[PDB]
Write a protein that binds this ligand. Structure first.
Ligand SMILES: Nc1ncnc2c1ncn2[C@@H]1O[C@H](COP(=O)(O)OP(=O)(O)O)[C@@H](O)[C@H]1O
Ligand SMILES: Nc1ncnc2c1ncn2[C@@H]1O[C@H](COP(=O)(O)OP(=O)(O)O)[C@@H](O)[C@H]1O
Ligand SMILES: Nc1ncnc2c1ncn2[C@@H]1O[C@H](COP(=O)(O)OP(=O)(O)O)[C@@H](O)[C@H]1O
Ligand SMILES: Nc1ncnc2c1ncn2[C@@H]1O[C@H](COP(=O)(O)OP(=O)(O)O)[C@@H](O)[C@H]1O
Ligand SMILES: Nc1ncnc2c1ncn2[C@@H]1O[C@H](COP(=O)(O)OP(=O)(O)O)[C@@H](O)[C@H]1O
Ligand SMILES: [Mg+2]
Ligand SMILES: [Mg+2]
Ligand SMILES: [Mg+2]
Ligand SMILES: [Mg+2]
Ligand SMILES: [Mg+2]
Lengths: 370, 370, 370, 370, 370
């Protein structure tokens, strides 16, 4: 009866039933093969470790993400993570409840085809559907009008949606996301005397960026304050026991979202892609899209990103237009919230692709249906 | 008991009961099909949108006019607009009150035949009548003598009417109207750096022409003032937030009414067709037609069109004759005013074509009756 | 008690009571049917228009004269004009006052019979009488001796009358009158660039001939003056506003009265028919008829017609005889003046044909009585 | 030695030498100024285009007729057409061969004066003559007795001619001709959905009337056949590629020749003007004029016009009289045939007005001579 | 003596002398600022790179087009490109030979004014002229009649031209051109696993579209062949060494020329705008415009675009009309060919705007002259 919604993101896998507020299953999407020979005999040494067990034993593992910027690079570990979150995390079978998968727009069709094939052949689900992460994150907002700024761990994409009709010709996609921010933070933290080279360590930098990084109102004056005094510096407690003192890196690595020239990308920052997509949209819907900029994803959780997004957009947009940046306090899981509120809808229950519909169509039904 | 009068114009549909001063229902006559796929599920997405709901959601629609220059191009959307203005706008049934339709002279008989067939078969009205827009606009003037300058959104026509006997052999018809003026304004506004290509945008140009365009007393001196200084330029507030600065376009696009060589037409302007029709009329009625030039329609609402019409006519007419241009302040709906004052007349109540009269006659009773 | 005198002429109907100087009712004798369909509903549109209401609304009517050259062509409109001048113009009933009708000599008996039948059957007058227009126009002169030159709109006739005994064997009749002059003026005005084809327009030419045409003392020298210079040309104010410049047409179309070869008639001019009738008269009354040439009718109102008539007659008559042309200043209505002065006479009151006399006699009493 | 005969008609200019059967030069009499700026440089763009070159390039021109209903409205283009037909069409000089011009009766003297002045001053012809179109069209018939029904493109006139003596007092002139028929066809073709507004298009309607229009034996029964079935409708191949389906318009627009109330004229049809002119003629020549009704002009080329003219005339004329309608198969150029057969006559060679005769007389010799 | 013709297009700058067949100077119109700091010292690092040097060093540059859809967005780089093509490419001075510039119709007057000001103030040319690209591309065809389908890199416009007189009221302009096709190809190539985000890469997609894209005879059957088998797929050699396998994208992105709904535009495809402009033209020139559809520009170089244009036009045009699509093998530079054949014309040598003419007129002489 109930439906499963599985937000297979690049950094986290939010999986839970339909009709509830919060996702019950949340864990990093990495698999870890044992790095060392393992002299001790017995104790249940396994070939792989998924999620929290990998996070706890990350010292002797070699963590890696199966999903790049949205595309699934490796498939065996992806279906392994799916089997894990289905059996060892939710303790349910896929043959009973329909599953709901999410993806980013401007996605290779091979990824969706392999998703459908894996879901229908290995697990044999009665029905499923492949929605868009940004559209669901807009559902969670309760409204139907406004452009969505969805930026997760691997991809940042924006799609403007009017009063039910979205604009596919203005869908912008930026490969700059949280993983690139973590890489830039690792690259700029070596200038302080802290080398993070290995994948296992990189997670420490990820947590440091998650709980110590913020976006400045403006770059120049915050640098001037960084240059003068240590009033800005703050210390962190490392798992090994040492302490580090980061200064301008607290707001320099989040600035890459607005100035991609730091990691080398030529793409316009997240504050300019939205304005360019709205300027590519229709001239009557711009008044409604300017005052509705729905943000989602874990990357939009920095303290002060909403204020800078606002300021930049009213700097780009005309003065008479008013800019509003909807910053929900549960925007980290807004995609899952939208999927769960979508799965309970009665009108949507008819457009699930079913096995009986899938047999004659093959793995190509997903493009024509979704 | 009461009778419905429905001025199914090319740009607006003025619909209301009989015996009242103002039409209660006024909205643009366009239907809009959804342009984009519509990813959001639910919320009441419809196949079409008529009138003000189309004007509000014109961003995602593709607006189009079912009526060209007076002829009804598409019939399904026309009867859809009729059903809309009957049920969702007036909340009345056509089976009870008789309806009154209007049309322009020199009209194809197929249009009137299809009008009668749709009104008698789909709605099954007890009685109806097809009058002429200019004759009704003259009724609204309270007088019976004078030529009528009726120019709406699709057609401009002139018919001289004496003390009850009109002259059908002098009925002039000009395909130049407000839609052509809007097209010319769109064509000449690209020279300033503002491209309006799509139908939805074109409505913005229509409102700009409605509330920023005027007709000059003479073209040459106003151009000389346009050439020298910006004393003439005025800014406009666009819905997107931007501002535009129009100069000579304020009086260049309304000049097409008097110089059709701008949009390419070879027809004499609205100031020469009236004089040629009066010169085609009888030699004793010219003295009464020269001093009575009743104007109507929304196109005759430009500031200064009455003065230029006067000046041009006394330039064409002999000097001893005096020219008067009746410019009523409610000439935008003068056709509807005349229809409503006509429907209350007791003598007219006998010449409605009824269903019992329509059965044996077929759809050809309208030509012999009206 | 009082008696009605009704001069039912070809161009005008002079109707009034007896014993007064001027006729109170004067209007053109034409009926006008509506030419156009008449789209406007109501306002009192009528089937016909008689007299001044037809003259005012002549633009949309098709005027026509019921009386040709003296004979009544159509009878329904004639009795309609009679009913009009009796009820809507004089506001009196024919059943009370006796009516007096006039006619031209050498008239078909059917016309007088139908006149008597209409007056006695439709209106039921107590008494009536059918006199001769020229005899009454001679009464108005106060004298009893002299030939009468009566020329109205349709017929020109001359009857010499001695000291009470008229000569019926010398009654000449010429079908050349004002209508033929108007037709000739219309035919010769097209050579200047002014086309008058329709009946309504023709009235404008009639007024132009009434107030701009004169008869020359001699044709040759006036042509020589017309040929040289524009000293003769004069302009006219048309009702439409235009102006025309007529030259030799001011005295060419009135010359038809003396040279009938212009409109094609073979009849001797009005200056030769009088001389031929006097030469057909008795040899002792010629001395009294030569010095008494009473003129009447509206056609004899041209400036200079009296002088030319004189000159022509003394050119035809012997030198020892003296020629006099009585040109009264009220000769336009001289027939009505004579009828009114005749109706007051006591001796005439006995010879009215009465209904009681009419019953047994039928419509043939008029020939034996009058 | 040879003489030029130039029938400067309202729609066509038939020009050729004398003594031959057919006119070598035939082309429409219109001049066309270039309507558009003409971006292409070179190629021989000219200020005007006359005749067939205007007909071929009528798309970018604005055609107009210098001759109205017989009067020459504009003189510069008229003398331009004369110079064209003299030099670029016949390749002859006017100084050598005498020219013969034609005109309609009841013509303004200014037109003939300007004709003579242009022919004697600009071209300096040795001699010329201004004849009448109907008299020449009667010459072409080989007989001398009979009334002529000459109806071209601008004027329809009738003049009865006996055994050498014509009757100028019975010359009727009707302004209804082929141009008015084309205008009526354009006005009544808009009821089928085909709008012809511009002058260039109007020529297409002219050809449609020339090769698809006929006159019915009677109006009522042909309408009854038009009302029932499409057995009457016929399609036409437009130059643009489209096809049209005309029904009752094939015989409705030619009916205007007999019922002028369609275009609004009050004049009696061509079947009543002839009878009224014959009834205005002499009573002994009516027997010879009834059996001789010579028709000419291009307007008399409709299939069935002869039969309807016959039927109408024997309906108007007495029964004992026999009516004959001479319908020659070359009546389209009968005026030119008569001019050419007239120019070869030896007796006519003496009455040409010569330059030596023209010097002292001025431009007024034409009225006294012709 | 010789004249310079400079086709400053949106994607390429064809510059060469007059009187020769091929343009000697051809290079992309982009400027590239150095993206990276440039650690190496010396070697001639420059602030900008224009044309082929930018194409060779595009890896470290950020290419951008100064011309949008025809309008010049940035002026400093535009005059820089002009100075480059004048000095570093042709090695000539502008002060000696007159220059000829081209532009698209329906162009903002500010662009032409700035063009004239830059050419007369910075370079001080003796004379110049601003022609239209489509008119020149028609000159290159050697004929004068036919509509031109000019579609370059930024704008597609159509102007019908008759035998020297063009029709400015039927000039259609479509903002869909090769740049939009390249953007659509980049958007649809991400579905195969190849992300092109940066401007430098986009040139690789441009070359892929130039040498691997074709237009199908019909969309449906070619999709059916694309769906079934890889018989359609073809590989490409990337500069980095990798190979790509494109399938339906070979004919899907060129279909945008006929179905603008792919990139979101509401404009009718290039096959419908031509038919709508011809239907807006005159009815006599349609027969000559249907059989003459001159194509030009680099976008019209796809294999099979001529056949599809033909088929679509005979599908829209009537059947009796014959459609011809002139597809010249040098239509990529047809505008330059026409400019060069135009500059050698003797008649055109008089209408160059000169400095002495420019002084008193200011930068506004270009509108009144060209
Ligand atoms: N409190 C926080 N502040 C800043 N960044 C955060 C915070 N929490 C998570 N993130 C970043 O957001 C990313 C998670 O993205 P997520 O929303 O899970 O993407 P997806 O929905 O595609 O799985 C992490 O990589 C982390 O770097
Ligand atoms: N205030 C105004 N000034 C100038 N033009 C106007 C104004 N209001 C309306 N119009 C023009 O008049 C047109 C409406 O014509 P309308 O009178 O409704 O025709 P119809 O009676 O046939 O419906 C509109 O297209 C608009 O361009
Ligand atoms: N002032 C005038 N000068 C010249 N002609 C006139 C004048 N007034 C009237 N007429 C002519 O006289 C005619 C009127 O004739 P009228 O005497 O009324 O005849 P009847 O007595 O038979 O009615 C008119 O047709 C008009 O043409
Ligand atoms: N075959 C035809 N059938 C009917 N009408 C025709 C035909 N040919 C020509 N006409 C009409 O006749 C007119 C030509 O008149 P025409 O005899 O040339 O007058 P004119 O002699 O004064 O030049 C044209 O306008 C055309 O409408
Ligand atoms: N062989 C080809 N096949 C398809 N498209 C081409 C080819 N060559 C060039 N193009 C396209 O044509 C465009 C060049 O347009 P061009 O004719 O130079 O415009 P302009 O004349 O305005 O400079 C390029 O952007 C390219 O995409
Ligand atoms: Mg995400
Ligand atoms: Mg209207
Ligand atoms: Mg009288
Ligand atoms: Mg003729
Ligand atoms: Mg180009």
């Amino acid at each position: 009866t109930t439906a499963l919604v599985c937000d297979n993101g690049s950094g986290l896998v939010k999986a839970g039933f339909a009709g509830d507020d919060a996702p019950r299953a949340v864990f990093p999407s990495i698999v870890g093969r044992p790095r060392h020979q393992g002299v001790m005999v017995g104790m249940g040494q396994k070939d792989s470790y998924v999620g929290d067990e990998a996070q706890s034993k990350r010292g002797i593992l070699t963590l890696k993400y199966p999903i790049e910027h949205g595309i699934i690079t490796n498939w065996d570990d992806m279906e392994k993570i799916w089997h894990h979150t289905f059996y060892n995390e939710l303790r349910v079978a896929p043959e009973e409840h329909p599953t709901l998968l999410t993806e980013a727009p401007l996605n290779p069709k091979a990824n969706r085809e392999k998703m459908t094939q894996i879901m229908f052949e290995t697990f044999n689900v009665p029905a499923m559907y492949v929605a868009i992460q940004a559209v669901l994150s807009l559902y969670a907002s309760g409204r139907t009008t406004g452009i969505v700024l969805d930026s997760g761990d691997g991809v940042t994409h924006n799609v403007p949606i009017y009063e039910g009709y979205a604009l596919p010709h203005a869908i912008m996609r930026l490969d700059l996301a949280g993983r690139d921010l973590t890489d830039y933070l690792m690259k700029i933290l070596t200038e302080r005397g802290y080398s993070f080279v290995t994948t296992a360590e990189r997670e420490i930098v990820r947590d440091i960026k998650e709980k110590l990084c913020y976006v400045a109102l403006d770059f120049e004056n915050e640098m001037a304050t960084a240059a003068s005094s240590s009033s800005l510096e703050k210390s962190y407690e490392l798992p090994d026991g040492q302490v580090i003192t980061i200064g301008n890196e607290r707001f320099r690595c989040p600035e890459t979202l607005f100035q991609p020239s730091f990691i080398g990308m030529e793409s316009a920052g997240i504050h300019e892609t939205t304005y360019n997509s709205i300027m590519k949209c229709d001239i009557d819907i711009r008044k409604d899209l300017y005052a509705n900029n729905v943000m989602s994803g874990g990357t939009t959780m920095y303290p002060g990103i909403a204020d800078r997004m606002q300021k930049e957009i009213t700097a780009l947009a005309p003065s008479t237009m008013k800019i509003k940046i909807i910053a929900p306090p549960e925007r980290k899981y807004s995609v899952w919230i939208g999927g769960s509120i979508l799965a309970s809808l009665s009108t949507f229950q008819q457009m699930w692709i079913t096995k009986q519909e899938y047999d004659e169509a093959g793995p190509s039904i997903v493009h024509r249906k979704c």
